[PDB]
């Protein structure tokens, strides 16, 4: 069966620039059997184009493509805000009926570096009654998405007891926000005094540490 | 052509699920595609315009069934479910050129040993101040969060849920506000977990 491999995994470009998205097939194909889709958060994918640059109704002229054999490209020539999304290629065969998809390329907005604003939140007394402590570190409105968050409890680096989540890119300022949540039993929580999250990011000339002393 | 699917489903491992797809109102080849949370697209199979024949993706042969009379909704049944089957399931119409030109809105199917449970909501207490709500230990997805019943929208970030090792989900929702507003305004996060018919409204105050 045909296997489709897309590249790059993430493409970061500014509005007005030209995007080149690649799809490589494991065997030579005619582009009539390749289709491109756009997918935005919370929505079904949307058909754009077939492998030969043939666009479906309502697709703007700035979407084009080309290829033959194993290598195919989707080109978006003068990027608009509505073009930033995940893109998939798809191949289909009729005998026997078989469809497959590439793994997707994320097309994200490149903007200037913006440092995170950092905040730390202790667990609520209400949660502590239940036997668990969640400590939350917020990194707000930063760019690029890559960031490093380290937890230290009484200056002891933590490993394995935190989880991060990141928002989708903001539609107006093109930044990201990130949470890191440290989870401890109540007993472990009440054995220690200083809780700290230390943040490294392209926009910070030195790491930023926010902390509290448990019970102040 | 508009495609309308049935509602979200929650299943235990080993069970089956049956999702419907209805043309709101020519018949066409209909396909099913699924997408695990945060992952890519996976084709499952297709059914002919009449419904008289099907063909499935190899990975699902023996586990999936696609059925349509003629002008009845089309159904996709997936058996022997495991947690790997947790995904949004889409039906789609095929155009003559082979691409999928119309899609349903998707149906979330969650497969887990966990049981439905509403969230516990805890405050994340605060010239700019940050405050929030920790929405912990619910099942299944999704929850919605608003602030001040939708009157507060600027500066809100509601994070994607994470699945914890317990099998329950958790997320946080935060908002930044002027520090000066902390005495003239009251902030309440409104959490709605329709799968458990639970709503929580939690006031978030400086401690």
């Amino acid at each position: 069966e045909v296997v489709l491999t897309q590249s790059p995994g993430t493409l970061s470009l500014s509005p007005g620039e030209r995007a080149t998205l690649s799809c490589r097939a494991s065997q030579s194909i005619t582009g009539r059997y390749l289709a491109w889709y756009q997918q935005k958060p919370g929505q079904a994918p949307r058909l754009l184009m077939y492998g030969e640059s043939s666009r479906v109704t309502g697709i703007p002229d700035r979407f084009s493509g080309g290829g033959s054999g194993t290598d195919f490209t989707l080109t978006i020539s003068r990027l608009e805000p509505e073009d930033f999304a995940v893109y998939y290629c798809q191949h289909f065969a009729s005998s026997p009926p078989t469809y497959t998809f590439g793994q997707g390329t994320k097309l994200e907005i490149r903007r200037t570096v913006a440092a995170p604003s950092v905040f730390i939140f202790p667990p609520s007394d209400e949660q502590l009654k239940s036997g668990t402590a969640s400590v939350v570190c917020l990194l707000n409105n930063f760019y690029p998405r890559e960031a490093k968050v380290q937890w230290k409890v009484d200056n002891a680096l933590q490993s394995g007891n935190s989880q991060e989540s990141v928002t989708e890119q903001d539609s107006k300022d093109s930044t990201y926000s990130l949470s890191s949540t440290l989870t401890l039993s109540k007993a472990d929580y009440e054995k220690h005094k200083v809780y700290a999250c230390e943040v490294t990011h392209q926009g910070l000339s030195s790491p930023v540490t926010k902390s509290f002393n448990r019970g102040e | 052509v508009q495609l309308v699917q049935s509602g979200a489903e929650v299943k235990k491992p080993g069970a089956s699920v049956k999702v419907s797809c209805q043309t709101s109102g020519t018949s066409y080849y209909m396909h099913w595609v699924r997408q695990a949370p945060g992952q890519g697209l996976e084709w499952m199979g297709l059914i002919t315009p009449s419904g008289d024949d099907t063909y499935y993706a190899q990975r699902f042969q023996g586990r999936v069934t696609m059925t349509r009379t003629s002008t009845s909704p089309t159904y996709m049944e997936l058996s022997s479910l495991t947690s790997e089957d947790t995904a949004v399931y889409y039906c789609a119409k095929m155009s003559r050129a082979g691409g999928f030109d119309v899609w349903g809105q998707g149906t979330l199917v969650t497969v887990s040993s966990a049981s439905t449970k509403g969230p516990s909501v805890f405050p994340l207490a605060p010239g700019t101040a940050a405050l929030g709500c920790l929405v912990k230990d619910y099942f299944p997805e999704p929850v919605t969060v608003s602030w001040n019943s939708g009157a507060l929208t600027s500066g809100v970030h509601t994070f994607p849920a994470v699945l914890q090792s317990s099998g329950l989900y958790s997320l946080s929702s935060v908002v930044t506000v002027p520090s000066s507003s902390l005495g003239t305004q009251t902030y309440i996060c409104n959490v709605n977990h329709k799968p458990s018919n639970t709503k929580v409204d939690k006031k978030v105050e400086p401690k």
Binding site: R32, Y33, S94, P97 | Y29, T48, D53, M94, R96, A97
Partner: peptide, 15 residues
């Protein structure tokens, strides 16, 4: 050139 639907129709007519 034949459409993909035509290809699929032929497949199911003969299988």
């Amino acid at each position: 050139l034949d459409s993909f639907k035509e290809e699929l129709d032929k497949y199911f007519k003969n299988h």
